[PDB]
Amino acid sequence: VDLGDISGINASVVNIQKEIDRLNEVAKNLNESLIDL
Amino acid sequence: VDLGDISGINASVVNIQKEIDRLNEVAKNLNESLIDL
Amino acid sequence: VDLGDISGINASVVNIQKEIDRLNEVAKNLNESLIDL
Amino acid sequence: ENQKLIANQFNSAIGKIQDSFSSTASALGKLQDVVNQNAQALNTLVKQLSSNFGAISSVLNDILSRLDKVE
Amino acid sequence: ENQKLIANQFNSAIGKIQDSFSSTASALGKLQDVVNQNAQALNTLVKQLSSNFGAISSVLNDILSRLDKVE
Amino acid sequence: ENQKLIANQFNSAIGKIQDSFSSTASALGKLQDVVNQNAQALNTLVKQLSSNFGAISSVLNDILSRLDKVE
């Protein structure tokens, strides 16, 4: 009895921490773009 | 014969409905920011 | 011996390529909204 | 004249930003729905797998005991 | 002078918004790819699991019948 | 007067855009955490499933060989 091998099934991981950091950085830096007449 | 217990394996759920609601609210409220000279 | 059937378990797929294309299109088109006094 | 230009560019930009935020909201909603469906699928698979290994176990213990009786 | 200030602030804000939308698009694309790969992985696991439980079943029925023959 | 209107509308829009980008960042972070947890869960399930099929196999081969000895 030889059961099918399933060890090859792999689930990838996502790494969007750069993009989240950029989004928070922009949400903070947009205060430097407010108009103060 | 004692097979390994796997009942502890749990898959979390995400709840970003607050953020989606905020995004749609902003997409609607940005009409209150248009300039009408 | 009749083991439980699990073939009905299905994992959906997401199709947000329209939204990603729209986001990149807007990130490109916002150059047509810069002010050149 | 320059004020009309600024206002028109700002209105165009705000319209594009509204469209983009609606797109981001729709994309996040679809991703939430799909991730939650996949989580429910994995949880149901874990439950059915636990049940099936329980059944396979019980059957194997029946076999082992009844074969110990045999020999 | 105030018009130049408004134009410069607006151009800076539009540049930052462009960068942020490119970032959001890249993040949504990566999340889509990863969620779809995980969905394909779970589906392939479900298929292989169904096949393996089919095989384990058939083997157990062989055992049970041939042991009924034994006893 | 029109400049004050443009500045006020622009500041309101930039505040709303800041809130929306913070929301998008929080949503992407939550989605990343959940997708990564589900990936780790599927990987751990695959490992435990491989171990359990290994054990079930070895047991079935024991049964088959010892029943070949029987008959």
Residue numbers in the entry:
A (entry chain D), B (entry chain F), C (entry chain E): 1164 to 1200
D (entry chain C), E (entry chain B), F (entry chain A): 918 to 988
Task: Copy the relevant paper text.
Two heptad repeat regions, HR1 and HR2, distant from each other in the prefusion S, drive membrane fusion by assembly into a six-helix bundle. This HR1HR2 bundle formation is thought to provide the energy for membrane fusion and is therefore a target for therapeutics, as exemplified by peptide inhibitors that disrupt infection by the HIV-1 (19, 20), SARS-CoV, MERS-CoV, SARS-CoV-2 (23–25), human parainfluenza virus 3 (26), and respiratory syncytial virus. We therefore designed a scaffold to efficiently determine structures of the postfusion HR1HR2 bundle and its mutants to near-atomic resolution by single-particle cryo-EM.
We determined single-particle cryo-EM structures of the five selected single mutants and the Omicron triple mutant of HR1HR2 using the same molecular scaffold (NpDps4) and data processing workflow as for the EM structure of the wild-type HR1HR2 bundle. It is possible, or even likely, that the mutations affect the membrane fusion mechanism in a way that is not related to the postfusion state; for example, this mutation as well as the others could affect the stability of the prefusion spike, or the transition from the prefusion state to the extended intermediate state of the S2 (14). Overall, none of the five single and the Omicron triple mutations dramatically altered the architecture of the HR1HR2 bundle, as indicated by the small RMSDs between the wild-type and the mutant structures.
